[PDB]
């Protein structure tokens, strides 16, 4: 199928798991507080190759889905 949900950053990949880790320490948080805590934690996260490999995988399937967007429009 055409029209993909676009690819993500290495940040967004980690933020989804960090949301659950931040919920364990702060009960009032949802997503925007996790984005602020996220900014300070990602600044200190060297060797981010897990997060970079997962977003690079999403970029390859995005390029595949985008090829079908030109085949169907």
Note the residues at the interface with DNA (CB under 7 A).
Answer: 5-12, 15-16, 19, 30-32, 35-36, 38-39, 42, 55, 59, 63, 66, 69-70, 73
Residue 25 CB, shortest distance to DNA, in Å, is 15
Q: Which two tokens stand for residue 64?
A: 């595949």
Residue 34 CB, shortest distance to DNA, in Å, is 7
Residue 72 CB, shortest distance to DNA, in Å, is 11
Let me know: does 54 contact 16? Beta carbons within 8 Å.
no
Which value, in Å, is the radius of gyration of the alpha carbons in the chain? 16
Chain centroid, CA 23 distance in Å: 18
């Amino acid at each position: 199928s055409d029209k993909p949900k676009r690819p993500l950053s290495a940040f967004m990949l980690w933020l989804n798991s960090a949301r659950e880790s931040i919920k364990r320490e702060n009960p009032g948080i949802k997503v925007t507080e996790v984005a602020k805590r996220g900014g300070e934690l990602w600044r200190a996260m060297k060797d981010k190759s897990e997060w970079e490999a997962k977003a690079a995988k999403a970029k390859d399937d995005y390029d595949r889905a985008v090829k079908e967007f030109e085949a169907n429009g």
